[PDB]
């Protein structure tokens, strides 16, 4: 009857929604594998470089030039933090050291990993239909809407950074320790949930039988809830992925800050009278850069 066509049409539309999302998430995974490989190299280099400067400054090995070099270091940071590649959104503010924004992003990530289980249950409910109305997990649906809403608020890029309070200024390298724990989007969980959901709906192609009105109403609610959930999770995933990219850039920026600072130390004591500790320090730093370059190569 017309009910069978209505159900089959909805099911095709849902599977098409998953097909589009699965391709997008696969592209994200492919890019993330490349980024994750390079991100490990960056963080190791930043940890090594940060230690080397900590030793360099804490022991006052620079001597009278300490103050002058520090001023140059600030100038270096100022030239990097203002790189137009760093967007004014709170996502990049978190990536570059801001704490309050980072905590919110992490909490959103952790919650999304659990709401995905709800999405699977919604699809499984449709399988149980094709009066047995499931109680429906509309609850977590309220939450995914709020999470998607906040993600849009975080990802928004303002005309000027002054619109974001406590935006990372030149002092973005001081919190580089926060970059040690790589932020990972739930890309694998998304693919598992979406592929299982699509396959489960694929197994409903043969419907047959006239259904009671109460069954069709219950299916309708499930389909509507799944549609809302997919759009909500898409907004969340894109924002969580953007932070992964932002964190990669932030780690690169800190490494560039340290690299340029080491270059100034080398040049400054090549023009002025170098000490032995300075040459030893620079050789240690050059080793860190060489290991970084070899890792990329």
């Amino acid at each position: 009857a017309t009910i069978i066509n209505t159900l089959k049409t909805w099911f095709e539309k849902l599977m098409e929604l998953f097909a589009k999302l699965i391709r997008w998430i696969s592209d994200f995974k492919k890019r993330d594998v490349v980024v994750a490989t390079r991100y490990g190299k960056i963080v190791r280099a930043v940890d090594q470089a940060r230690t080397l400067f900590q030793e360099l400054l804490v022991k006052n090995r620079l001597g009278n030039r300490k103050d002058a070099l520090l001023e140059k270091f600030d100038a270096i940071a100022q030239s990097i933090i203002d790189d137009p590649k760093i967007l004014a959104s709170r996502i990049y503010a978190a990536a570059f050291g801001s704490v309050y924004y980072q905590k919110e992003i992490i909490n959103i990530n952790n919650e999304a990993r659990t709401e995905l289980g709800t999405m699977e249950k919604l699809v499984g409910t449709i399988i149980e239909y094709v009066d047995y109305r499931a109680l429906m997990p509309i609850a977590n649906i309220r939450e995914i809407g709020k999470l998607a809403t906040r993600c849009n608020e975080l990802s928004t890029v303002y005309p000027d950074r002054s619109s974001i309070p406590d935006f990372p200024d030149k002092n973005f390298w001081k919190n580089s320790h926060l970059l040690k724990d790589r932020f990972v989007a739930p890309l694998d969980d998304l693919l598992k949930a979406y592929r299982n959901s699509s396959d489960a709906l694929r197994k409903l192609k043969q419907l047959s039988r006239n259904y009671s009105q109460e069954t069709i109403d219950a299916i309708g609610e499930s389909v509507q809830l799944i549609n809302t959930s997919l759009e909500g999770m898409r907004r969340i995933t894109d924002t969580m992925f953007e932070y992964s990219q932002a964190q990669y850039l932030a780690a690169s920026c800190v490494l560039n800050y340290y690299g340029k600072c080491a270059q100034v130390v080398s040049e400054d004591y090549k023009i002025h009278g170098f000490n032995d500790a300075i040459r030893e320090w620079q050789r240690r730093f050059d080793k860190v850069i060489d290991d970084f370059k070899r890792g990329y190569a």
Binding site: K72, D74, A75, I76, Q78, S79, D82, K260
Partner: peptide, 11 residues
């Protein structure tokens, strides 16, 4: 020339 924007100007 030494200053607070020297490195931005180099870039």
């Amino acid at each position: 020339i030494d200053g607070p924007e020297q490195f931005k100007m180099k870039d």
